[PDB]
Amino acid sequence: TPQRVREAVQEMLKYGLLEESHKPNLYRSALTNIEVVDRILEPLDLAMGVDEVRGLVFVTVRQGEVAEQDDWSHPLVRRQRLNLEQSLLIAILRQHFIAYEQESGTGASQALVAVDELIPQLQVYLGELGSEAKERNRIITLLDQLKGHGLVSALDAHDRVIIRPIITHLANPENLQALVVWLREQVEG
Amino acid sequence: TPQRVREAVQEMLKYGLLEESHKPNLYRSALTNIEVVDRILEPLDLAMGVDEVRGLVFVTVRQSHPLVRRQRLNLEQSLLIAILRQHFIAYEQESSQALVAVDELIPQLQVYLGELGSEAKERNRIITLLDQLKGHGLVSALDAHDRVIIRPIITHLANPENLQALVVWLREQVEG
């Protein structure tokens, strides 16, 4: 087994994703050995997703013959499930990412959003608290909860957050449709 | 690949140990599929060791390993490891699970690290050391009657190199 393949597998499993912009060598090594990586990860019940357009190599749960394995009962899964408040925040961040991606061209750029811009839109649904401090603390708590899932990063000195492109694979149209149907069933009865 | 085999391999790699008293089904599945587990763990530079006397299935680095981290312990942990190992040896020479009282280890630790002069200090030090060893998965949870359970892994604590280092350090501490 090539050393580069093993190192790429180790790094990808440790971090959950590989980005060419930061790890071009690992990205190329894992991208050129899809069959080998699939063979190695098959006993672990894991699968690899690649987005060459956005340059990302992520790891998801391998699909078995079981109709509903729930994708959360895997022994190696450590993270908690997702509730409705975080789901709405993720949808809003996905809309922000769409807006960023529409008016974008060649060149290296990042999606940064200020908290104050996000506050009123989430106040529209959740509501408004008596003091701005309460709402700000709630928003900071939610942003920390989402950062625990690797969707965003820590705040900078100018009260801004960075939306990772991984949300694009989190809010893919299939998952969006499934969640929309589930929420519609939740509302209807 | 059988689902039971994959589950046993995943659990064994996740925990590093398998006991029939806790998971008899997984223990039987792994013990009846030695070659399959060895084939699965071969690309990972890992091997399965079986101790049928105590039903202990452990993972050993077959051959300093990318997936295994080396960390050293201090004397305040080394001497307690020696005390627990000798207690388990005495218990197994008596022929179940080795039950060691909290009050038992207070004098064995005081005669080596001195007397702190307070019962609270002794209890806190014993609890902290026991929790540190719990972080390594060497003993079980504390019982209601200030007792702990010693796992069979103490028999497979380490190679004779670490046992010789342990006895040398224990003799040095006894010298003071």
């Binding site: 994708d71 959360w72 899964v77 993270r79 408040e85 989190l170 998952n175 589930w182 | 996740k14 997936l67």
Partner: peptide, 25 residues
């Protein structure tokens, strides 16, 4: 306006799952 509804888990597969911190050794 209900905390129970807001904390009701949804259905979204985990994407970009990292390692479980440590192999517990």
């Amino acid at each position: 306006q209900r905390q129970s509804e807001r904390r009701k888990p949804a259905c979204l597969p985990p994407v970009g799952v990292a390692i479980t911190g440590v192999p517990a050794i």
